[PDB]
Amino acid sequence: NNNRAPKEPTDPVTLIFTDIESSTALWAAHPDLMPDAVAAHHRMVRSLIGRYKCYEVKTVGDSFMIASKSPFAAVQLAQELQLCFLHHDWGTNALDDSYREFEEQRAEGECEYTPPTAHMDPEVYSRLWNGLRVRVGIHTGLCDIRHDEVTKGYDYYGRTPNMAARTESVANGGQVLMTHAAYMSLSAEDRKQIDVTALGDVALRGVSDPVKMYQLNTVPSRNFAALRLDREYFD
Amino acid sequence: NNNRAPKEPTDPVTLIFTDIESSTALWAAHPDLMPDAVAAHHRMVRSLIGRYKCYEVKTVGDSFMIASKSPFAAVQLAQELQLCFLHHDWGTNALDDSYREFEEQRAEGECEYTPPTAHMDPEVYSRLWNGLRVRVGIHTGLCDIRHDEVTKGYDYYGRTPNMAARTESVANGGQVLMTHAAYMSLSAEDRKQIDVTALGDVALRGVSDPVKMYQLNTVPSRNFAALRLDREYFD
């Protein structure tokens, strides 16, 4: 369905990048659970890509690159991605136990770091966290648009996908960040339907000027540690 | 039976608000049918309040405020309220004719509006709709709990009843909305027993942040128009 691919160069494209946080460590600890968990992740993300009439550009591992002709549809997809992953029955508590242990250890080396979820009573934790924790970044801007390579699909190049991917790279698992560009691409009425928290400006590697980031609040009362300025970014 | 009243402040309370949609217009058109129809409505709702061990906080007109120590019991009550009202013999088609006429007229002033039920063949319509159409909202949260006023009963104050009532106010007749808070108050096993449709987030008057709403699917294949952002809310 190339019909949903943004194709007009003069119309800004909204790009969404996603990743499972700590995917290396999770595959090392749970090699018999990750194939099925990641396959479920892809089925849920792809169901949403179709629901919101977005376009899958490409997937590498568990990393998705998704384009949308509509900034609000992209924001709705990211919000529903966090909510259906929370609602999904993963059939194991092992992935939640691993994330919690990682936070407790991380609190040894970061003295400014306090585990956001590891010490939550199970009744509090389950209403807020469950299963794979996916980080998401969203940016909107003009793109250099191309068709195929050989795939018969569309791709996007330049500063716009670079910023979207660098924005996602500093997000925590379970957190959705939007640049100010994406936030102000939404109409005023669209903004009344979402809940954001300003995070200020973040210097991103490769990007000249610091970027003002907004946290999209999806799962209510979910909180996070500081942004992960120490990264990994798409390709 | 104050025994069923939620009384522990540290335990979240599940509140259910209900209303007959278009009650003014129905009493104006059918003053000789409404007393008996509304009395039957109250008998059915009260039968369910007892069946599900919930607590009637108060009723004003045809509006019920019901509290439950159990989120799943409240959801079961709302589902059974829609089903027994559909099954009840109202002894008249006049109320169904009025709702259908209202939809047809409403389609003149809302060009984005299509009647959901007015043009259904009678065999389709009767399996889905019959009699008074009750809107329901459900939310779960910590409440400011008090005893009496003089009534020797318990009441609930604060943000929790405010959100439950504002949530009900935007529902259509025949529709049950739950906030995400209520949905995630249910256990995972409880969620497998119900069928919900995400409706995104809705900005509610008086409430700071938009609220993510879920439609509880009760009567199978029943569909609705957009949420009624133009309201009326409890008191």
Write the layout of secondary structure elements.
The structure is a homodimer of 235-residue chains.
Chain A: E1 13-20, H1 23-29, H2 34-51, E2 55-60, E3 63-68, H3 71-87, H4 94-109, H5 122-128, E4 134-141, E5 144-147, E6 154-157, H6 159-169, E7 176-179, H7 180-185, H8 188-192, E8 196-202, E9 211-216
Parallel strand pairs in A: 4-7
Antiparallel strand pairs in A: 1-3, 1-4, 2-3, 5-6, 7-9, 8-9
User: Which strand order do you get reading across the main beta sheet of chain A?
Assistant: 2-3-1-4-7-9-8
Helical/strand content category of chain A: alpha+beta
Question: How far do the termini of chain A sit from each other?
Answer: 24 Å
CATH topology of chain A: Alpha-Beta Plaits
How many structural domains of chain A? Answer: 1
Shape-level CATH architecture of chain A? 2-Layer Sandwich
* Helicity level of chain A: 25-40%
- Major sheet attributes of chain A: 7 strands, mixed
Largest interface: A-B, 16 and 16 residues
Describe this structure in words.
The structure is a homodimer of 235-residue chains. Chain A has 235 residues and is of the alpha+beta class. Chain A has a single domain (1-235), classed as Nucleotide cyclase, GGDEF domain (Alpha-Beta Plaits, 2-Layer Sandwich). Chain A has helices at 23-29, 34-51, 71-87, 94-109, 122-128, 159-169, 180-185, 188-192; strands at residues 13-20, 55-60, 63-68, 134-141, 144-147, 154-157, 176-179, 196-202, 211-216. In chain A, a hairpin with a 6-residue loop joins strand 5 (144-147) and strand 6 (154-157). The first copy, chain A, is globular and about 50 Å long. Chains A and B meet through helix 3 of A and helix 7, helix 8 and strand 8 of B. Chains A, B: This is Receptor-type adenylate cyclase GRESAG 4.1. Chains A, B: Could act as a receptor for an unknown ligand. Chains A, B: It is found in: Membrane.
